[PDB]
Structures are given as structure tokens and as C-alpha cells.
């Protein structure tokens, strides 16, 4: 529970501690997709 | 007297009183009204009083030479939001109406300016010119200068406003804009990061500032050197600590700043920086940085050994050491002190530095996170307009000086109100 | 004998002073006469292995101050005096340190 | 006896003005400053500049001796006053006011590096040589 | 191991070897001041760096309520039944989630590591 | 992140890797090496150890439980009370003390579990070093059966009468300093 | 790869350039598309 | 947001 | 913006109830653009002076003799900056200060006083940038909060008891994120503080509500724990173009 683990179903419906993580791993993945979008289009136009 | 199991209820009463007296945008409003009110003032008191005298190699003789002309701003004052007319009578200005014809919503700023004038017979005389009008400052909205405060919801649709707008914006040439909170690292903060690809292993960085009185921040650097260097004697000595002090070109070793402070005793410099000798570790670790320093043993020898790294190198020896001992009194660890014998607690502060970034070298504490958020301001309307106040405010009394000085040259007469430029603030 | 020259008889006859910090009302109850020559009493009680310091407001003053004792082998205190007449001279060392708290 | 129950009580007194104003002059333990071998001292003004509001220069038995140097306290007490009790023959205490505070710091009376030959010397700053044979050559 | 200071200048001393009578010195630079060395140890350097750090851990960690506590262990002078477990709280202590206990209570502060 | 760990050894992968190889990249950010035993070393997991400890590279430090410095005047004389024993064993029969000894003494002292992790020897170190310094550094090694590994250093014998150097008599980087010099270069640079 | 009991024939480097100075270009040439094929087919995507 | 080894 | 280092953006621990987690705008600005939590509270600042006062008249010594000596001298109490001495006992000092808070006289409800236990270090910052909150205060495992003061709340017109009276009783208090490093909270009063398997007995605060947590935008979404995290950020950036 501590570290992050949420045992709670999305039915069930998150406890505060575990809302907060999971906003947090959600965060992470929106970050890498709008790094990545950059990145990959550079490489894209060098092959090019 | 406990309220088990019926707290659903209790939680939202008393988040319901929470927001009944506040609101959402208690932040914006807040910061604003502190800033006038405060801000303007100190600002204005902070600000050097003006001098100025006529040039002596302009006229010849000392009888009137010297015209000391002496300008201070004693206070200040806001009236409520006004528009003048073209007519030029004042009329107040409601929010709405400065939306509809474009115009700021903003209030007139008086200061009163004393002018006291030595004639070098000493028969000084002071005018004071009470309520200087010297710019406009736009009012938020809903804050406490501005005209809907304290208004009943029937009287805030009489004016053609919304009872349930929050406020917190400026009304700038007839459109809202809101200043937006911008984060900022905190000041006055000894933070130690390790940067891999530095050629330091450690960095203890503290972005002092003098209450925001004046300049922004006044950054300086204590970080060890990385052993990662390889030499003879570079292998000998390990890791030395070196300081990056503002106005200085290059590093300058940190053992050298003690001395620089009046610390000549090696055993005095680390009673600040190793504050239990008893620890062994922590003096091995001291020790190559007072071998890079032992060529310096006085507090003249550090101070010219400062000014020769100079950003601006100067010609003579003891103006050298002149220039880094005002340098060092200024710009080095501000809020700690600027001024007379404070000098004790600015090598006590830096001690503490060396002694955190020694302690974070040894692993005894952990390296501060830039992402933790008490490590992290927030910049509301009030410090941002007060910075604004400041530049500008500055501006003003350089434009003041120089008409001034033209017509003091003249030896004619000066005259406050041509030389405030409302211009300038507004 | 010249004028730069330091009257070190105090540190010669060992003369032992006490330093005492005290708060701003006490003194500025002080400074309003000043001139009396009378503030108030120092009364110090000692047991068999424990000693108290207190002091005693003048009643006309007013119209206790218990004293904590503090260490001073940590640093080495003299009191000297600059005269008028351009003499220096030492009135004593340091011997003990003491604050003034309210009650 | 009576020293384990003596209860010493005194008279306070201020007066108004006193004709030589009264300082602190507080040394370092660790400098184990010792008063036996003060023959003479002068303490004056210093010259730096090369006058109440600059530091002070303390030079104990002349050149052959000590010298300190001693700065008032940066810090002003606002909110705080320091009093001397003196033991004087009418048996009453004497609270006098601290005009200032001194922290006197000494200055050894060894050889010192000249600021040129500082400066050639720092040039060399990987000084593979030992550096004591160096402080013997100056 | 540790370092001394000179007794004239209060600066550093270095050692020196004392050629005729082959016993090591100190010396201050700065000064002709001369000292015999006690120790004959002058640089020790632990690169496993063990150190226990009961010698780190203040008691006053005692009183920090974010911390846990246990009434299993007791204390061994006091026999106190709450005991306050941390682990090292340090950077660069190898690999070790060994917990440290302090003792709760006023002024005992004992330390035992299990 | 969130690849499958078949081995404990880390790989870039996705666009930073596609980054790596399109830009040829003098420095990779994993720069990695898959080695395939022919014999039947590869069989078997002990021969296999000994080849991962010939290709893995070791320094001295990493063997080294702790070093310290001691100022010995005579070798005789035996300043720890524990070399008494050994150094009077090498010095029933001394060797390279005709020229002299060095006053200092450098008293590595070596973890056994590191030593017998990576399978060295006592011989082995104390041979890397006395070869690849020259006669200058002097080493005696205690036995494995001791308890401590101890290895104890000193400056050459011919600098220290200085008979051999002739020249001018004048102490270069004095003898401590240059001692320490040398523990800094054993403790990265060794390549044991 | 000349350390005893190790396969000349098949040990293999990561470092295309590695590959370039001790192997060859035709030997970078195979350890490039080797490479590439392994990020791109590590997600399971197959490109021709 | 669901495992190490899976996405976030 | 164009940094691509994904370590500014991450949202940080020390977020938790200051600045939404869902409400953040997606593209170069992902976790660079924030928004306040609903019961966040921005310090407006204050003079140091009254502080530093009590700080001198309780102890702290200044200027003192290498009395820090293996920090023997627990804490060295730290300002906006500014070390201004230290004090033998750290504990008596903090709990004073707390009771200052509380009678509002030299501590105004924004005054943030940190206690770091290990490295000895008191920080009382009050520099008008910290983001605090109002959390809840428990003394033993009691919520300070009782019925008379949500009984006198409910009446909150004419009764002429406020949120502020709340504060001034000392039942409420502001908390920012350095003294949230030094806070154990509750999320519930019953769940938690209530004695059970015993998980923290030494709870010094609790959460008025865990739903402030989120901002203006994601505070309209029903059920945001039943929501993918993503999708409340998306929630967030549509409420901000709904026509109303
Ligand atoms: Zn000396
Ligand atoms: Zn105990």
C-alpha cells in the first residue's frame, strides 16, 4: 500500500493514497507520449 | 463532545465556512492588496534619497557651489480607480465601463516628495510638494482599491456586474488579464544537488536575497571538485572545495573566503565549517582545500586574491582589495547581512554551506530534490508587480536625476513636478 | 607610561565581574530616573550544594526576576574602559554570566 | 559553617553618567590569552584606510608581542542590555551599561608572505615540492 | 588519525619525519613550533568504509512521530517496552535495510541494531 | 523501463537504442558484449567463473578492506604488534634492505571475501605490484592462513639511502605525500 | 574475443563502431541490421 | 499503472 | 517546453493536496503548467522581526562559542534564511511556538515552523511564496475539532462564528509542504485515528476531506475513482471548453 500497490478495482473505486498513485503512474505515460512525439519525428525526417 | 460516524456532515460544514469566507481566488486578490499597500511603501522608502549638487568646475568660486539639492519620497497614497476626461475632471470608473471603452482600470499613485536644498550657507531649506502624482498602478479586480469591493450582490448588478464573478484579473486597456503564479526555486535555501557530468561532484547552492529589497537573487556556489581529475598531486590532495562567488570571473577556494573575512586562523575556519572536530572524517575531508589555501595567510593577501578574479580588474593594489571587501559586504550571502560587523555571521553561514556539502559528500544527508515542492515558491501578483515597481520606480528617479542635473548646472532652479515622468510607471 | 597605554591593574588585582543580560523593560524602567542612584535589590541565596540568584524591583520603581547562571569556561570575558581623558584601562575579567527572565 | 547557608543580599545602583565609557572585551579559549605577560599594550584606532565608527587595533608589549584585532558586534541589541557588577568598598552592586562589544582576534607574530611573491607562488599551485622548504626560503 | 593544531598560530601541523632521531614530528609551517607524535599512525583510510552508525543516529529521533514503533523490543537499561525502528536514512551505506532502534522515553536513547 | 529481465543486465531499447544505431554514436549509452565459451568451459559453471573473473576487470580497491599509513622507523621495530611476527619471519633472511628501508609504511589490508570471490592471490597481487612499480615498491605479504591480509609497503630502498639517485640531496614530493600518491594510483589503477 | 576459452566465431559486440574497427564494414553492415531488427521486432512489430 | 513489466 | 526531460513534469509526492494531479494541460506543457488544490492557500508573507523577538526572549543564543559543539545545542534555529542562533532544547521551543500560533500573537496562521529532528535543523520560514493547506489538528488520537464548533459553524450566520474563529481556536491549521514532511495525517478521523490493529498511534493531523485534493476542473468529474487517471486529465481540459 505504501509504496503504491492498489488493490482496489476501478468498480470498486480507488482509495485516496492509491488515487494519488495512480495519477501519478498516468502522469509518467502522458509525459512520455508527448516527449516522444518530438523525438521520433526528428529521426523520421533524417532517414528521410 | 466527539462526533463519531456523523462526520460526512461535519467535514463539509466546515468546508462549507472555509469557502464562505474566502472563496477560490483569495490567492490572486490577497497577494495583490499586500503588494500595494506594503510593497509600494518600502519600496519607496528602500530606494536611495536623491542627491545632487552643481559641478564645481562649472563656476568658479565655492560661495554657492555646492547647491546640495536633497529629494526623498516620504509616503505613499492611492485614490480609488479614476478616468480623467478629456475635459480633465476626474470621474471614478466603474469595471465595466473601462471594458466597454477600452480603458485601464487603474489608480492614481502620490507620493510626497520633501526637497531639501543647502545652499552651502547652511541655511538649508525643505519644501515639501505633498501628494506628487507620479503613476498609475492597475487595481485587480474585487480586490480591496478596487470600487466593487465591499459591495452587496444588489449593488454589484446596479453596476452592470456579476455577483458570483470572482475577481483577480486587471482590466488592461479594456481586457482581462490575469497574472499567472510562475514557480521559482526558494530563496535564502542551501540546496546541495550532485551533477554527474560537472566537474564538481557536489554543488551547495543558496540563492540569496535581501527580503526582495533589491536585487532579485544573488546566487552563490560552494562545491567540491571532483576527484575524478587525475594527476600527481591531484591524486595526493583528493577533493577541493571552491566557491563560485557572484562577481567573480573563476572559482576561488573556499578556505581563501574564510580568510578573506577576517578567519585567518586555520583552526578558526573549520571551528565554522566542521562544527564537532572530534569526527575525523570530516577534517580528512577539509584538509586538501586549506593545503590549496596556505599560500594566503592575511585578510589583505585573500582580498586582493579575490579582486584579481574580478569580473573588472582594477589598476591599484588596495583598490583591488577596496573593490572585493564592498563586493564581498554586498553581494556575497545578502540576506545573511550587508552591512558593518556582519562579516561573523556571512563566515558562520558559509561554514554551514561547506559543512552541508561535506556532510552530503559523505553520505551523512541526503541531496536535495529541485522537484520537492517545499523547495519551490510561488510568484503571485504581489512579488511580480513589486519587482515591476522596482525597475520601474528606479527608472524614475534616474529620469528625475538627470533633468534635475541639467538644470541644476544652470544653476537656475528644480522643479519636482516637471521631472517625474508618469509615463514611466504607467 | 604614553596614550595608546592600557591600565592593566584590574587584571593585576584579578578584580571578578559579572555579566548579566537583561530585558528592555527592566532597563528602560531604569533609564527613567537614572539618576536616584537606587533600581532595585540583589538578593542571592545559597544552600548546601545549590545557589539562586534573584532580583528585587524598587516599588517605586514598579509604579521577581529569578537569574539562571550560564557557563563561562567556554570563553574568556574582560570589561575595559575608555575615559574621557583618553586613559584606558581594564576594570576586570569575567567570572560569571547570568540572564534576567521574567516571571 | 556559614558558608553553606550565607545569603548575600546588596544594593543596586546606575548612575546617570559615567566619565569613561564601559565595553566588552571578549577573547577566544582557544587563543589561551594570558594577562601575566602584558607588560604594556597599545590599542588604538587602526589605518587601513591607508574614526568612532572603524575597528579597533590591540598590540600587546609592543611589536614583540600579540596583536589582535578587535570588531564591534554587527548585531545591535534592540531588545537587550548588558550590565558589569563590580564589587566596590560600600558593598553594593554598580550596573553600568555596555557601550559596545569587542571580539579581539590575534594575528601571529610570524614571517609574512608578500602579496607578489603570493601571487608567483599560487601561479605554481601544484607545488610538488615540499611546501615547508618553501616557507623556510621566504 | 586526527588532526592537531599548532599552539602559537592555531594552524595546521604536518608531519615530518625527524631524520637523526628517526621519530615523527609535527610541525606547523608558519611557525618553528614542534610537536612529538603520540599516535605514529598519520593516514587511515577505510574503503569499505564500515561504520556503525549508532554513532550517527541522535536520540532525540526519539521523538518524531512520523517514525514506527514497536513494544516488542524492550530496551536494555531501562527495559522500556516502546522502541522507535528507522533504517539507515543514509546515502551511500551500501546495501543494508538493517533496522535501528531508539530507545522512547526521556534521556535514554540507547541504541541496539538486530 | 518495463522490459522483461531475462538477465540482470541492462538494454536501450525503442527510440533512444534507434538514436544510438541511426546516429552511430561513438558513445552508447549500454555498450555491451555477448561472450561465448568454445570449450567445455561452457558446460560447466566453474570454468565458466574463472573465465567471468579473467574478463571482469578488478582494482585494487575493490580487494582492498582498508589502507593505512604508518610512519615505522626501524622494521624491527614493528609499530602494529601484529607484523612483529611476519616481518621477523622475512627479515630472518632480509632481502632488498641492503640498500636501505623506507621510514613509511603503507599497510594495505584486504578483504578475504573479495580475495576469494574473484580468486586471487596473495602472490598475485604482490607480484602485479612489485613488477609493474620495479624494485621500488617493496611488498610483504602475509599468509592466507593468517586472519588478516596484510600487505605492507615501502619506498625504495636505494631512494631512501639515496646513494643510487646521487645528484642533489633534496627530498622530492617528501616521502609521505609521494606514499600517498601511490596508495591513489594502487587503489584505481592496479588492473590485478 | 582472443581470451582463452572464449568462441572467436560467435562473441559479439552491442557497438556497431566496435564492430567497424576489429570486423569490418560488411561485419558492421550484418551487426547494424542485427541491431535494428532486434529493437524494432523486441515490441513483436515486423518490418519486412 | 498496472505493473512493472506491463505500463505504468 | 521544448526540454525533453521527463523529471520537471512527473508529479511529485509533495503535490498531495496543494496542486491538482489531473488538472494539467497536455502537450509541450504536460506537468509544467499546474493547478491549485481546492483548500490550497498561498503564504501572502509577513515581517520576521516579531519572531526573531520570541526567539530571543525564550533563548537562542547568537553569537555564542562553538556552542553548536557535535550539535550538543539540539536544532539551530533557521529563519527566512538567516541562522539566528541555536537553542539547547528544541522540543520546549517548538511546542511554545505552536501554542503562539494558536493565540495568533507572534505567529500568524501562515508561519511555518519545521523541526528536523536528525541534523538538528528549525527552519520557521515565512518568505509569501509556500503553498500550504488547512489540516485538521489531533492531540493524542482525538481530532481537536468537536461538536461545539460544528454546532457553532452550522449557525455560521448569526451566529457570527467563522472559519477563522475555527483557526483561532487552534482546531484547524495551515501546513505547507516542509511541514508536511514532518506531519503523520489521518485521511478519516474514524477509519484511522480509532484504535484497531495499530498501524501509527502518534497521528499529529488529519485531512479535512480527501476530495480537495483535486482542482476547480476535476472537482465537476462524479466518481474520479472510478475514472483511468488520464481520463480525468482529459475531463479537465474539456470542462475548461464546455458552453455554459
Ligand atoms: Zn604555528
Ligand atoms: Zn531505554
Known amino acids: 500500500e505504501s509504496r503504491g500497490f492498489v488493490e482496489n478495482s476501478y468498480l470498486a473505486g480507488l482509495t485516496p493514497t492509491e488515487f494519488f498513485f495512480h495519477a501519478m503512474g498516468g502522469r509518467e505515460g502522458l509525459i512520455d507520449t508527448a516527449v516522444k512525439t518530438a523525438e521520433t519525428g526528428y529521426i523520421q525526417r533524417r532517414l528521410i | ?426 | 607610561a604614553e596614550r595608546g597605554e592600557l591600565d592593566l591593574t584590574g587584571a593585576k588585582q584579578n578584580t571578578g565581574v559579572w555579566l548579566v543580560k537583561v530585558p528592555k523593560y527592566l532597563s528602560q524602567q531604569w533609564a527613567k530616573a537614572s539618576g536616584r542612584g537606587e533600581v532595585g535589590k540583589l538578593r542571592i541565596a545559597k544552600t548546601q550544594g545549590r545557589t539562586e540568584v534573584s532580583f528585587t524591583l524598587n516599588e517605586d520603581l514598579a509604579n521577581e526576576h529569578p537569574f539562571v547562571l550560564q557557563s563561562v569556561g567556554g570563553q574568556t570575558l574582560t570589561v575595559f574602559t575608555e575615559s574621557s581623558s583618553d586613559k584606558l584601562s581594564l576594570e576586570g575579567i569575567v567570572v560569571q554570566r547570568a540572564e534576567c527572565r521574567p516571571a | 559553617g556559614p558558608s553553606s547557608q550565607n545569603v548575600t543580599e546588596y544594593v543596586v545602583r546606575v548612575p546617570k553618567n559615567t566619565t569613561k565609557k564601559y565595553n566588552i572585551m571578549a577573547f577566544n579559549a582557544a587563543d589561551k590569552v594570558n594577562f601575566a605577560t602584558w607588560n604594556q599594550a597599545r590599542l588604538e584606532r587602526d589605518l587601513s584606510n591607508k574614526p568612532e565608527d572603524q575597528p579597533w587595533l590591540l598590540r600587546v608589549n609592543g611589536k614583540s608581542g600579540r596583536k589582535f584585532k578587535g570588531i564591534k558586534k554587527g548585531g545591535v541589541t534592540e531588545n537587550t542590555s548588558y550590565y558589569i557588577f563590580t564589587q566596590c568598598p560600600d558593598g553594593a552592586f554598580e550596573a553600568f551599561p555596555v557601550h559596545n562589544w569587542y571580539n579581539f582576534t590575534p594575528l601571529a607574530r610570524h614571517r609574512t608572505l608578500t602579496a607578489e611573491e603570493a601571487e608567483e607562488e599560487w601561479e605554481r599551485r601544484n607545488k610538488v615540492l615540499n611546501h615547508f622548504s618553501i616557507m623556510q626560503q621566504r | 588519525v586526527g588532526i592537531r593544531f599548532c599552539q602559537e598560530c592555531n594552524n595546521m601541523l604536518y608531519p615530518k619525519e625527524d631524520k637523526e632521531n628517526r621519530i615523527l614530528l609535527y610541525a606547523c609551517r608558519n611557525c618553528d613550533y614542534q610537536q612529538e607524535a603520540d599516535n605514529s599512525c598519520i593516514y587511515v583510510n577505510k574503503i569499505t568504509h564500515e561504520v556503525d552508525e549508532l554513532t550517527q543516529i541522535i536520540a532525540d529521533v526519539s521523538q518524531d512521530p512520523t517514525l514506527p514503533r514497536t513494544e516488542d523490543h524492550p530496551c536494555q537499561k531501562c527495559g522500556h517496552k516502546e522502541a522507535v525502528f528507522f533504517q539507515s536514512h543514509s546515502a551511500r551505506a551500501e546495501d543494508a535495510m538493517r533496522l535501528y532502534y531508539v530507545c522512547t522515553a526521556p534521556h535514554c536513547g540507547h541504541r541496539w541494531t538486530e | 523501463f518495463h522490459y522483461a529481465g531475462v538477465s540482470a543486465k541492462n538494454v536501450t531499447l525503442g527510440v533512444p537504442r534507434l538514436k544510438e544505431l541511426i546516429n552511430i554514436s561513438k558513445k552508447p549509452k549500454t555498450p555491451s558484449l555477448t561472450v561465448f565459451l568454445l570449450g567445455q568451459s561452457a558446460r560447466d559453471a566453474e570454468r565458466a567463473k574463472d573465465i567471468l573473473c579473467r574478463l571482469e576487470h578488478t582494482t585494487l580497491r575493490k580487494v582492498t578492506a582498508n589502507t593505512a599509513i604508518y610512519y615505522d622507523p626501524n622494521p624491527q621495530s614493528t609499530v602494529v604488534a601484529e607484523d612483529q611476527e611476519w616481518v621477523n619471519v622475512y627479515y630472518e633472511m632480509p632481502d632488498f634492505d641492503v640498500a636501505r628501508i623506507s621510514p613509511w609504511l603503507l599497510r594495505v589490508e584486504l578483504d578475504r571475501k573479495h580475495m576469494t570471490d574473484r580468486k586471487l592471490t596473495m602472490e598475485q597481487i604482490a607480484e602485479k605490484i612489485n613488477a609493474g612499480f620495479g624494485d621500488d615498491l617493496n611488498c610483504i605479504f602475509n599468509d592466507d592462513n593468517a586472519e588478516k591480509l596484510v600487505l605492507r609497503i615501502r619506498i625504495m630502498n636505494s631512494d631512501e639511502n639515496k646513494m643510487q639517485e646521487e645528484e642533489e640531496v633534496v627530498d622530492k614530493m617528501d616521502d609521505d605525500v609521494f606514499l600517498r600518491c601511490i596508495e591513489s594510483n594502487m587503489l584505481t589503477d592496479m588492473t590485478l | 574475443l582472443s581470451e582463452k576459452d572464449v568462441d572467436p566465431v560467435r562473441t559479439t559486440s552491442n557497438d556497431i563502431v566496435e564492430i567497424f574497427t576489429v570486423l569490418g564494414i560488411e561485419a558492421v553492415r550484418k551487426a547494424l541490421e542485427r541491431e535494428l531488427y532486434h529493437v524494432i521486432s523486441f515490441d513483436g512489430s515486423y518490418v519486412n | 499503472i498496472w505493473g512493472i513489466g506491463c505500463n505504468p | 517546453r521544448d526540454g525533453k526531460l521527463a523529471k520537471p513534469r512527473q508529479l511529485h509526492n509533495t503535490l498531495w493536496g496543494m496542486v491538482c494531479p489531473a488538472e494539467t494541460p497536455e502537450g509541450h506543457a504536460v506537468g509544467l503548467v499546474k493547478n491549485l488544490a481546492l483548500m490550497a492557500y498561498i503564504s501572502v508573507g509577513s515581517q520576521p522581526s516579531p519572531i526573531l523577538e520570541f526567539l530571543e526572549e525564550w533563548s537562542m543564543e547568537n553569537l555564542e562559542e562553538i556552542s553548536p559543539a557535535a550539535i550538543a545545542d539540539a536544532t539551530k534555529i533557521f529563519v527566512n534564511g538567516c541562522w539566528v542562533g541555536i537553542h539547547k532544547d528544541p522540543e520546549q521551543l517548538m511546542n511554545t511556538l505552536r501554542k503562539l500560533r494558536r493565540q495568533m500573537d507572534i505567529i500568524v496562521s501562515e508561519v511555518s515552523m519545521i523541526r528536523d529532528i536528525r541534523e538538528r535543523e528549525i527552519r520557521i520560514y515565512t518568505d509569501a511564496g509556500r503553498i500550504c493547506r488547512p489540516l485538521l489538528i489531533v492531540e493524542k488520537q482525538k481530532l481537536l475539532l468537536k461538536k461545539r464548533h460544528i454546532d457553532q459553524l452550522k449557525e455560521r450566520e448569526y451566529n457570527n462564528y467563522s472559519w477563522q474563529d475555527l483557526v483561532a481556536s487552534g482546531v484547524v491549521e495551515y501546513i505547507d509542504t516542509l511541514e508536511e514532511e514532518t506531519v503523520m495525517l489521518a485521511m478519516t478521523p474514524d477509519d484511522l485515528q480509532e484504535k484497531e490493529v495499530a498501524y501509527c498511534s502518534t497521528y499529529t493531523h488529519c485531512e479535512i476531506h480527501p476530495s480537495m485534493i483535486l482542482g476547480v476542473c476535476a472537482s465537476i468529474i462524479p466518481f474520479p475513482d472510478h475514472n483511468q487517471s488520464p481520463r480525468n486529465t482529459y475531463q479537465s481540459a474539456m470542462g475548461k471548453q464546455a458552453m455554459g
Open chain 2, 1 to 426: 463532545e466527539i462526533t463519531p460516524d456523523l462526520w460526512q456532515e461535519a467535514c463539509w460544514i466546515v468546508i462549507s465556512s472555509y469557502f464562505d469566507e474566502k472563496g477560490l481566488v483569495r490567492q490572486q486578490l490577497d497577494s495583490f492588496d499586500e503588494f500595494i499597500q506594503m510593497s509600494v511603501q518600502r519600496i519607496v522608502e528602500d530606494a536611495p534619497p536623491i542627491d545632487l549638487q552643481a559641478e564645481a568646475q562649472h563656476a568658479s568660486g565655492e560661495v554657492e557651489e555646492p547647491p546640495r539639492y536633497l529629494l526623498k519620497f516620504e509616503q505613499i497614497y492611492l485614490s480609488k480607480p479614476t478616468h480623467w476626461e478629456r475635459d480633465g475632471a476626474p470621474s471614478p470608473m466603474m469595471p465595466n465601463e473601462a471594458r466597454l471603452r477600452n480603458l485601464t482600470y487603474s489608480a492614481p499613485l502620490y507620493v510626497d516628495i520633501t526637497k531639501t536644498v543647502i545652499k552651502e550657507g547652511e541655511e538649508q531649506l525643505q519644501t515639501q510638494h505633498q501628494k506628487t502624482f507620479i503613476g498609475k498602478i492597475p487595481i485587480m479586480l474585487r480586490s480591496t482599491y478596487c470600487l466593487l469591493n465591499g459591495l452587496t450582490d444588489r449593488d454589484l448588478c446596479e453596476l452592470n456586474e456579476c455577483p458570483l464573478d470572482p475577481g483577480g484579473y486587471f482590466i488592461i486597456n479594456g481586457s482581462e488579464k490575469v497574472l499567472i503564479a510562475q514557480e521559482k526555486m526558494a530563496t535564502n535555501t542551501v540546496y546541495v544537488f550532485a551533477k554527474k557530468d560537472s566537474k564538481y561532484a557536489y554543488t551547495g547552492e543558496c540563492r540569496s536575497c535581501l527580503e526582495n529589497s533589491s536585487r532579485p537573487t544573488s546566487t552563490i556556489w560552494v562545491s567540491m571538485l571532483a576527484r575524478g581529475g587525475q594527476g600527481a598531486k591531484k591524486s595526493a590532495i583528493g577533493q577541493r572545495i571552491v566557491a563560485t562567488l557572484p562577481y567573480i570571473k573563476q572559482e576561488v577556494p573556499i578556505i581563501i573566503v574564510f580568510r578573506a573575512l577576517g578567519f585567518v586562523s586555520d583552526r578558526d575556519i573549520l571551528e565554522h565549517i566542521i562544527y564537532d572536530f572530534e569526527d575525523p572524517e570530516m577534517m580528512e575531508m577539509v584538509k586538501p582545500s586549506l593545503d590549496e589555501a596556505f599560500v594566503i595567510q592575511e585578510q589583505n593577501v585573500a582580498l586582493n586574491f579575490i579582486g584579481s578574479r574580478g569580473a573588472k580588474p582594477g589598476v591599484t593594489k588596495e583598490k583591488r582589495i577596496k573593490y572585493a571587501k564592498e563586493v564581498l559586504q554586498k553581494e556575497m550571502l545578502p540576506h545573511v547581512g550587508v552591512s558593518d560587523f556582519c562579516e561573523t555571521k556571512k563566515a558562520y553561514f558559509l561554514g554551514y554551506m561547506v559543512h552541508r556539502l561535506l556532510l552530503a559528500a559523505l553520505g551523512r544527508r541526503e541531496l536535495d530534490d529541485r522537484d520537492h515542492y517545499g523547495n519551490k515558491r510561488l510568484d503571485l501578483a504581489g512579488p511580480l508587480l513589486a519587482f515591476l515597481f522596482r525597475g520601474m520606480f528606479k527608472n524614475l528617479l534616474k529620469e528625475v536625476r538627470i533633468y534635475a542635473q541639467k538644470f541644476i548646472d544652470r544653476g537656475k532652479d528644480f522643479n519636482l513636478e516637471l521631472a517625474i515622468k508618469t509615463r514611466i510607471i504607467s
